[PDB]
Design a protein around this ligand. Structure first.
Ligand SMILES: Nc1nc2c(ncn2[C@@H]2O[C@H](COP(=O)(O)OP(=O)(O)OP(=O)(O)O)[C@@H](O)[C@H]2O)c(=O)[nH]1
Ligand SMILES: Nc1nc2c(ncn2[C@@H]2O[C@H](COP(=O)(O)OP(=O)(O)O)[C@@H](O)[C@H]2O)c(=O)[nH]1
Ligand SMILES: [Mg+2]
Lengths: 264, 262
């Protein structure tokens, strides 16, 4: 494999903690966290970090492309301007290398999937969330993720899940769909059925072993436990859908960018 | 009655109205606000409870626009409007200050998102525009989102960033030697990690939040600083807020207008 994942969201949503908690890694050493004095006009930069990881015989080269500074400025206008240019750049790099007379070894840096994180503190999708997803759902597979699920009770999780699903339906956002299964397997058909009913995945990230979880004076949040958060469902969906995510990136989004650019 | 005016600054949904119901043990009119509001505005309601005439001034639409540049005028213009209303009442020849309704904001609770890092850029700019206008009490809204290990480093970065930008926050009076020891640890736990809840869980009837891994007791000091935030409701602390509002903030605005008026 050679999979590329993009992470987008406000700072302080546990994104770095989540992407680390997936394959139990540490992609962000010496993480420079700026202060509020240098964040009012902090532009959105793109910093990639590729990591090797073997998952039950599935050895893959995971390249994570974070977008530090998204939605942390006073005026978040054109915050998603650099994210757009990078994705189209990777499509252009692939279009140049595929059209050239020497395509023996090509670096495939196209973004196959893009996690977008939603703050659980508010009531639903914010204008920054809507104007981002609508401006990128036709170029990359958007996967909505409710960050920091452990601040929402049972009733609050189902309330926020259903609302931001209506707002996605209302604004016409094309998030990444999970493919339907054919008879085939019965247990796998039940697993993919609960994945469709759990989206948007309200997840929790933690690197502390206690069996990963978070410690509170009133209790312990079990990350790997589905009854507490949808971490295991997001991780399971990622591994089982890396093929489809890669294929839809090539056969759909890339081909649409190709046809659009060939007329320019 | 005791005219105490509170202003809740906080992003939409951070639990401003929930904490007010939790703190006064009642249920104020608390309709939610959507994230689709073109600009930050203020909604103020008046209530007569206990006996005091409470005025809660909430921030409607805060931190939702994509362009949050001009999201400070409506706050400052309101706080300056109440100062001008009190000042113009003084200038009146046949004035009635005893029956005049003092609508000046005495205390202002700032709800910080429980991100864990520090203050957003919106937080620093908003507090530096109001540090010379109102008594600012910063709190960490939805404090249960943060563990006690992270909460230690969080209050560290918050206090550090505030005292590095020269943001004048409110401190509780230590002049009285009796309240000296209690208001010492009181000021030492700012920002108050607060958790608001209107639901009750069986215990021996108690305000708490029910998670599948535990229950967060709002009135438990080891869970949250709500027990300490409730200390601002005593008569001496409320009087100190009104004292400082008129002695420092309003008198500053009064000396400004008297210069402009020549
Ligand atoms: N994790 C956590 N959730 C809370 C807490 N307090 C309230 N909530 C939840 O978040 C929601 C907050 O609602 P409000 O208090 O009305 O939000 P608000 O601050 O008034 O924002 P506006 O509606 O725009 O005025 C509630 O419905 C609760 O379910 C808290 O202390 N911790
Ligand atoms: N309550 C809660 N806190 C979390 C979770 N994940 C991470 N955190 C805390 O959030 C803080 C910062 O998270 P971080 O990943 O650096 O934020 P981000 O990288 O900007 O998205 C850390 O100190 C974590 O302890 C979660 O699922 N729930
Ligand atoms: Mg409210």
């Amino acid at each position: 494999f050679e999979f590329t994942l993009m992470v987008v969201g406000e700072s302080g949503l546990g994104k770095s903690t989540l992407v680390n908690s997936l394959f139990l890694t540490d992609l962000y050493p010496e993480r420079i966290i700026p202060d509020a004095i240098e964040k009012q006009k902090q532009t959105v930069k793109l910093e990639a970090s590729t990591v090797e990881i073997e998952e039950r015989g599935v050895k893959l080269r995971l390249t994570v492309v974070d977008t530090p500074g998204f939605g942390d400025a006073i005026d978040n206008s054109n915050s998603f301007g650099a994210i757009l240019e990078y994705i189209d750049e990777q499509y252009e790099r692939f279009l140049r290398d595929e059209s050239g007379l020497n395509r023996r070894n090509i670096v495939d840096n196209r973004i196959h999937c893009c996690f977008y994180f939603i703050s659980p503190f508010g009531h639903g999708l914010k204008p920054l969330d809507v104007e981002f997803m609508k401006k990128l759902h036709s170029k990359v597979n958007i996967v909505p993720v409710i960050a920091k699920a452990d601040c929402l009770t049972k009733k609050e999780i189902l309330r926020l899940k259903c609302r931001i699903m209506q707002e996605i339906e209302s604004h016409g956002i094309k998030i990444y769909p999970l493919p339907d299964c054919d008879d085939e397997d019965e247990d796998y058909k039940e697993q993919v059925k609960q994945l469709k009913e759990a989206v948007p995945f309200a997840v929790c990230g933690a690197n502390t072993l206690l069996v990963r979880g978070r410690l509170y004076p009133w209790g312990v949040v079990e990350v790997e436990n589905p009854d507490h958060c949808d971490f295991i469902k997001l991780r399971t969906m990622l591994i089982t859908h890396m093929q489809d995510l890669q294929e839809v990136t090539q056969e759909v989004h890339y081909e649409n960018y190709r046809s659009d650019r060939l007329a320019k | 009655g005791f005219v105490f005016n509170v202003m809740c600054i906080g992003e939409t949904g951070l639990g401003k109205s929930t904490l007010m119901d939790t703190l006064f043990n009642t249920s104020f009119e608390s309709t939610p606000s959507p994230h689709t509001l073109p600009s930050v505005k203020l909604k103020a309601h008046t209530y007569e409870l206990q006996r005091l005439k409470l005025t809660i001034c909430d921030t409607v639409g805060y931190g939702d626009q994509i362009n949050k540049d001009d999201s400070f005028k409506a706050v400052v213009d309101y706080i300056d409007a109440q100062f001008e209303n009190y000042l113009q009442e003084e200038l009146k020849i046949k004035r009635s200050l005893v029956t005049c309704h003092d609508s000046r904001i005495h205390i202002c609770l700032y709800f910080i998102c429980p991100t864990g890092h520090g203050l957003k850029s919106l937080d620093l700019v908003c507090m530096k525009k109001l540090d010379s206008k109102v008594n600012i009490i910063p709190v960490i809204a939805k404090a249960d989102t943060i563990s006690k290990v992270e909460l230690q480093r969080f209050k560290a970065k918050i206090i550090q960033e505030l005292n590095a930008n020269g943001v004048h926050i409110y401190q509780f009076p230590t002049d009285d030697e009796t309240v000296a020891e209690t208001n010492t640890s009181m000021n030492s736990h700012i920002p108050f990690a607060v958790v608001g809840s209107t639901e009750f869980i069986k215990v021996g009837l108690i305000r708490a939040r029910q998670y599948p891994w535990g229950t967060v007791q709002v009135e438990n000091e080891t869970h949250c600083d709500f027990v300490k935030l409730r200390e601002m409701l005593i008569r001496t602390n409320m009087e100190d807020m009104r004292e400082k509002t008129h002695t420092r903030h309003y008198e500053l605005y009064r000396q400004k207008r008297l210069e402009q008026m020549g």
